[PDB]
């Protein structure tokens, strides 16, 4: 029975979407990446919707709303994979119908990116990350996304402050045994940022190599980096 912003982000959390890899297409690197880029395109729509439930996000200018999402979108996608993967060992749950082990990662050419995502999984598993913390960190990653293009720096700082205050209140209430738990959660964000950079670089390379079709929204978010 905790912080109201945390409560709200929990009920704002979107429903899972399925990858639905085309069962008429033969299994290949191109099929795996096409499947993952299609899933990312669809999850970006859901993410834009979610961001509007984040208290105060909708009061920013449309330019600032776009700036935060263009900076943070891959971090938010990664955190979803991470959260879904916490009850697994050495597997990434991209979706309930798309669980990637080492074998599938090698076949997709994603072994290095997927190993970095697994390092995030193993850290949050050792901290026993709760859904409450997951949704709060997702929002903080959006607010703290270091865009060079913000118009109202004070308004974005205020959003950062509101969500950080929510995280601190939740940990103070729920995790009295570890007075440093909120800071330990914030100290996971550098590896999240690092992994997002590697993922965006990787998918940018795939876009240039021209062999994997990609939807308009995914390509626009990739172009913005």
């Amino acid at each position: 029975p905790y912080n109201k912003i945390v409560s709200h982000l929990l009920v704002a959390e979107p429903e899972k979407i399925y990858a639905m890899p085309d069962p008429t297409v033969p299994d290949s690197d191109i099929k795996a990446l096409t499947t993952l880029c299609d899933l990312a395109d669809r999850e970006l729509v859901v993410i834009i919707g979610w961001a509007k439930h984040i208290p105060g996000f909708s009061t920013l200018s449309l330019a600032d709303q776009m700036s935060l999402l263009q900076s943070a979108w891959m971090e938010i996608l990664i955190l979803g994979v991470v959260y879904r993967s916490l009850s697994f060992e050495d597997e990434l749950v991209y979706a309930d119908d798309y669980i990637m082990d080492e074998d599938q990662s090698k076949l997709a050419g994603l072994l290095d990116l997927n190993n970095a995502i697994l390092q995030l999984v193993k850290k949050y598993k050792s901290m026993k990350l709760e859904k409450e913390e997951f949704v709060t960190l997702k929002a903080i990653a959006l607010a703290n996304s270091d865009s060079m293009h913000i118009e109202d720096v004070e308004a974005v700082q205020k959003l950062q402050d509101v969500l950080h205050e929510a995280l601190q209140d939740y940990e103070a209430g729920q995790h009295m045994e570890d007075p440093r738990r909120a800071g330990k959660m914030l100290m996971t964000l550098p590896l999240l940022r690092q992994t997002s950079t590697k993922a965006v670089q990787h998918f940018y390379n795939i876009k240039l190599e021209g062999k994997v079709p990609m939807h308009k929204l995914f390509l626009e978010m990739l172009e913005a980096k």
Partner: peptide, 11 residues
């Protein structure tokens, strides 16, 4: 113009 903007203005 951007689909991101479109979806931010939508519904």
């Amino acid at each position: 113009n951007s689909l991101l903007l479109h979806l931010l203005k939508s519904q």
